[PDB]
Amino acid sequence: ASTGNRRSHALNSTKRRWNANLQKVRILVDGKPKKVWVSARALKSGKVT
RNA sequence: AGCUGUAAGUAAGCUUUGAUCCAGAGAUUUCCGAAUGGGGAAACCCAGCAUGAGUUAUGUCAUGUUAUCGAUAUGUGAAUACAUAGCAUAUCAGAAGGCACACCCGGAGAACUGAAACAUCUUAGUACCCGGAGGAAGAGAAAGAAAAUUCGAUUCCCUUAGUAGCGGCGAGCGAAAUGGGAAGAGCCCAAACCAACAAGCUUGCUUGUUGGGGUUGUAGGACACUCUACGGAGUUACAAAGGACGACAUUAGACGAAUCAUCUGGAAAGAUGAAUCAAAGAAGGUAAUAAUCCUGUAGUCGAAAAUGUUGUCUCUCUUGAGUGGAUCCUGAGUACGACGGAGCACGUGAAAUUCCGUCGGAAUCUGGGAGGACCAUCUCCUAAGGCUAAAUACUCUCUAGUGACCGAUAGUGAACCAGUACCGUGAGGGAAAGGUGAAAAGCACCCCGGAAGGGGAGUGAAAUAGAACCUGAAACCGUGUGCUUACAAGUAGUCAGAGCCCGUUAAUGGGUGAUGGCGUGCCUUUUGUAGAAUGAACCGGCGAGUUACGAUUUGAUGCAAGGUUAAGCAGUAAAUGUGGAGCCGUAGCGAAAGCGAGUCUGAAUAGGGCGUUUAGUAUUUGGUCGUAGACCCGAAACCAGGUGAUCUACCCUUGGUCAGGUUGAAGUUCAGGUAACACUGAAUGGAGGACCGAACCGACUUACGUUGAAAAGUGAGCGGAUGAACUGAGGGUAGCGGAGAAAUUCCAAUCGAACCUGGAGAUAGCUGGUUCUCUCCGAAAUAGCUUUAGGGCUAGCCUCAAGUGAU
RNA sequence: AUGGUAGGAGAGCGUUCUAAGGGCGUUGAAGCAUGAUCGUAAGGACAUGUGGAGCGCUUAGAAGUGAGAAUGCCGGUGUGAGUAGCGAAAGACGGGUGAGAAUCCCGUCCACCGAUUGACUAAGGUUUCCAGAGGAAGGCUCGUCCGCUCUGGGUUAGUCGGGUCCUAAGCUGAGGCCGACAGGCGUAGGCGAUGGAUAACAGGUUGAUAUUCCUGUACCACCUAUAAUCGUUUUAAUCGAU
RNA sequence: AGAUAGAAAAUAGGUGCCCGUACCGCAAACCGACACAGGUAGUCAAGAUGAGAAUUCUAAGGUGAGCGAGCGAACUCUCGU
RNA sequence: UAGGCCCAAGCGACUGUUUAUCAAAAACACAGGUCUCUGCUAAACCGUAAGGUGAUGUAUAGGGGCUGACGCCUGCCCGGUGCUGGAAGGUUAAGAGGAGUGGUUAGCUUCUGCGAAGCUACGAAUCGAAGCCCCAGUAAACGGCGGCCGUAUAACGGUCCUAAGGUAGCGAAAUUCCUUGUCGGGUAAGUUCCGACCCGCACGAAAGGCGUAACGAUUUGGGCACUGUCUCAACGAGAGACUCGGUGAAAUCAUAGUACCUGUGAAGAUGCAGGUUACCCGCGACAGGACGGAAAGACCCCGUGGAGCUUUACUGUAGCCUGAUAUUGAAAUUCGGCACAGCUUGUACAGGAUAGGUAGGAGCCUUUGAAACGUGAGCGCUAGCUUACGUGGAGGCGCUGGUGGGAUACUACCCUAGCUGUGUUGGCUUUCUAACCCGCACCACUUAUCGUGGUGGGAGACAGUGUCAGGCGGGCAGUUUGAC
RNA sequence: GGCAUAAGGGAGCUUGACUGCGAGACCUACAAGUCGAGCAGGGUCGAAAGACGGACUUAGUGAUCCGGUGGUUCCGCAUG
């Protein structure tokens, strides 16, 4: 998903995205240590490096 | 017992050994198209490998095979020593990719429009862009909702109610609680236990693995207490009986009713006389209208995959073993919240569900935790930790079988040659034309000009019934005959009369055609029109008032102390019957609590407002409003998805072309004046967005063309003509864009923003139209206000209907 | 005593069916189109044509109901004129053929284009090419030609032009990068002529093809036999790079 | 390099696939609704005259124009005095 | 078949380009100027991004703006706006801190507020960067270069206001209203033309001024040649006119046999209604009707009908700057928390015997020592004030009493501080590397510079990216532009 | 338009610059706009009858949202 509005003071609307905070890091996927994008929230408590 | 599709007639065969047909099963199935050997401008070109045939051999041909990620076993394994990747294999090719985008779930998501734009809001989470599955999903056996005394594991589809609420409190949007149909079907990780394995470890333990155990607690288990199992049995699921599993349908289907004869035009199916046999007896199609020719309807037997699918249905179930909840377990970046937003009827906020980014950080029996602002009581969970049921959606046309229906400007654009002629570069747009049979019997035969006629001829119950056998009509228009009719000034008619006729569906009938008076449309729009205001020959598909469904005002009644049905169910797609989990009147008043023939106001019980002093609807059914898009036709334009650089503008790569003349740059070199060669005379040389001028390229004047030869041309002159020249082939840039020596110029005869489809019947306070009836009688026409003023609303002037009744 | 584009309550007709009743009808029954009736209607009961098998009346109900214009649409039809025009250029006569000739064929003379109105090759078009025979239409006539019919047909390559070669601009592109999706970009590599590479000329011959067919003379490749020659197969003229 | 013996050559034999090919083609056959005075890349191009591919006439080769044709004012258009 | 020429002015240097289809020009280009941006993964531009152009370039280069060969030149104003820079003056949002306050509660009297412990809604003392404000510069940046009375800053005087009021050269001009201005030349006659004047409505110096050889299908004036252009006819061909034809269309479909004469219709007249004239029908020769059309007027209105374009119209936004946070680490320096607890003087007419900027302070310290005397902190104009005391000993004081203009008993506590180390908390600036990032170099996969890995180098907790905040934002959008 | 019934100056004060209605009150499309009696119900001036619900009369201004006060009569997230 992750679209929605930007709203003005007179309450106009323009469509707009919210992007995740992807950072490129080297994780240990199956086999090699590989570089990949993953969000900062996801490596808060999800996945080893 | 005939047959050789449509798209007809021979040779023909079949063949009683059963043709042609009709069902079922198989076999063959070129080439292209995810196309997948490689390539490509689909339907073509070019290969390899392995067999095989051929060949003295090649060449040639035939048959197989050769496009990425998963699984089995692996193997090798550069920068860098092994490893593992990767890698190259061998196999199943496994599996991707096939969609009526009608229903469904997701992602992303306009706009014209409404408000008398709108920008909040609405249109609308709509179009249709993309992705999924599919005969669904979601949900779910609950931090589940319900808030009375709860409740229905759920769950999903037809009452409350246009209510509560939301809302530039505008336009508008718009619930749920309290139930019918259908109906439950329960699984995990967690706790400890146990048994093996290995590893660490020092064989103790721990780690982990495999398995039984258990999924809700005002407790489940180790336990701790205590003593039962195939009792029931069960397949849509966890044990399946997979079973002989006991009817798929009794489905292909096919056989299989029963009547009828006579007289007058072809025949009876008009008048006589008869009949039909029971589950059919019922409709409906055939030179004549057979509930009794084709046939069904009834009956019959019924075969492949069938087996109603069951009442033992092998295996095999699960008889539950009762107390406590005391200690452990009950799910992690999480409950849990800030900040931006979205969805919830609700305009984000005082928010109970979701997204991004950041925070962080619980608890355990003295459990904790959760529920449209906080603390105590009620319901819930043992959320997040997880799941998965059926009944529950929906029909291109699938398939078959059927109807105040399409009756063929038709359900269809197309019941015929139809997505075809044709049009467009392409996306795309898109017609016209339909119609024996009684039987071709289609004019043998025969006679005069090719076509076409005139005769006979005919199957011809009837060819002015001749290829226009669907016949077949009209009108416009015709054209050839004739009866009457010829000094004039014309809304062509009408009211006043010599010649010629003569009468049906019958009686001042039926007329026909000559003279003096008088003389303006469907029409529309107007103060006013007949045009010098608009628009117009004939015919016609053929061309301008439903309901979802509401509101309000004008017949009959259950039937009036009174109101039930909506859905549902049973019935032939009817009537009808049934239907209280269910829905207007009999009472009003107040903002409300509340009171009640009254009540509000008032601190009053006061006045005064609004009521009382009977009539409604289960009602159902005949004019006007509302929502629909709403009497019809017509914009300029907006948005979304696509198609276009074969024209033209730039550019890229690679090619080509330019008669002939003239001038004579830089440079060189000799010599008149020549001597400190030196200036300037001559030879040479061949430069240039040089000059004149053909081909080629342009387009300044003019004439001609202007229903042109031509949707930009011809004649005569004219500018450029070795360059910032001209030109071919193949490429590239695309519309919220491109290109532009710049003109609002060009992007397929189009451009202050192309073309096609769609939203889309956009919107149109403006213009035009608005018909077969005829009613009869009856109203006419200004003040006031106006995000808006040639429009609108209320009053006036109204018709119609009731009423009081001197007004 | 008795008008009104806006007004209310009115009696009626074309299509259809119920829902009926009752009729006209295969010695004929239509309807429809031409007939004296009904009439304000709309709408129906007896002489030609039609056919040749379909309709009315009565009562009631339902409306693809409801027919002069909208610069309306068209199955569409047909008018309004012997008018405008017939699209640049030189023809004349004789013969022939024929149902019929300013037109077709043959002849002679004359004329026009001549850096082209000539001759080749591309693109493009796709049977128009060539013979016969009728052209019902076609052609700004006729047929007594082709651009309708029948076939009789008719297109021949080692060397010509393309593919089994090479690459440019571009276009695609395994792995890779990016991106709500769809998708965009891009590496080796592929594809891609307008360029590079590559072997044939003279004569004869048909109604219709020709560097293709035939005749002569050549040239270029590939394969198999044929022989002397090079003879560590390293090297060696040969092989020969990845 | 490397690799094999090892060649080739010159003769004699065989063998040589696929696609195009007709016709129009600066036009009656292409693009232009048309048998339309337009547009359409390249090659060849004889004699006289001339500098010339200019001009005028002509060879070769093509064609008599393509349905329209026969008679004889105003006016209009092209042309000459 | 094959250039007409000469004299004179405008504009533009030139060849070139342009509105396919009414404009070829004086408009565009141009070679030259000049300004400005940009140190290389350049700026600029396209794209959501990746990629890419610039450029296989590197300040003698590249992008943007204005001017437009050449020659002589290019004056004044930096107040206003824009751009640049600086001092940094002040001001702030998201944020961090936590002084304090409400809301609940056994909590406390139980007729009642230490809100205590905790839970909750707040909250200021603050700090916090851009922008904004200020100051300087810049006019081949945007712009401006005068009113006023004297009088057509014309003369020169006055002002006015911010900043200045037009230098050269031109000048009735492609610019002049009055206006055909006036005078001369050219002609018989000159509104144009040329020369001259200056009273420049309203010329003027890179939206350049003045001049200029050559060039022009440019504009404009005069002359010669020459002519049917004109004063002011014949001939030739084609169309037309007569005949034939394979021939045979088109543009209005009230409809109606359709004179010259009225009044007047929705007033210039068929049918709308007094007189005059006219026998029926054709063929060759033009405009009243149709106020023709194949044209539903192209400068009012509708109707918040459309559309394009502009801006200091309203509302937004692509984007751009700047913060805060996440990715996101380590040590040290400087100092906020513990910096503890912190001390004193300088000089002063005035306490009391003359002290520290100073605050709450009519009040504490007060056997937890208060003032002179041997003497002690720092220091002196030797008065002796603040402080710890044994020989002595109850006071010095203090905001106030103040020759005073403030003030030191308790207490921040001190600039004048210097500082010993302290559990540990949080700023600032450096410096490190492991995050992360190099269109970064060499080396292998490789076939391959894309990419992946190795090694060395650069850079570095920044940048980049995500979320939030704030400023700017006709670059782009939707609208409105009241209404009479 | 009125006005000497003052419709100008003094006293006391005051405070009628009153609370609820309105028996019974005109204009007007609508919405809106224009005076007395009764006592809930209490005053001021007057010796008293009485007069007084602003001024000689007629101009001197406004639904939705928001703020504040007061009653007091609603609400419930499960119940309080």
Ligand SMILES: CC[C@H]1OC(=O)[C@H](C)[C@@H](O[C@@H]2C[C@@](C)(OC)[C@@H](O)[C@H](C)O2)[C@H](C)[C@@H](O[C@@H]2O[C@H](C)C[C@H](N(C)C)[C@H]2O)[C@@](C)(O)C[C@@H](C)C(=O)[C@H](C)[C@@H](O)[C@@]1(C)O
């Ligand atoms: C060749 C023939 C062309 O007509 C012309 O060029 C003549 C020469 C025009 O003159 C015009 C003149 C010029 C300026 O137009 C005014 C221009 O518009 C066009 C190009 O040509 C005429 C006469 C114009 O009439 C007049 O138009 C005026 C608006 C009003 C005038 N009258 C009512 C008062 C009216 O008669 C009007 C517009 O063109 C004719 C319209 C209907 C057309 O479109 C006609 C069919 C053209 O297409 C036609 C083929 O092209």
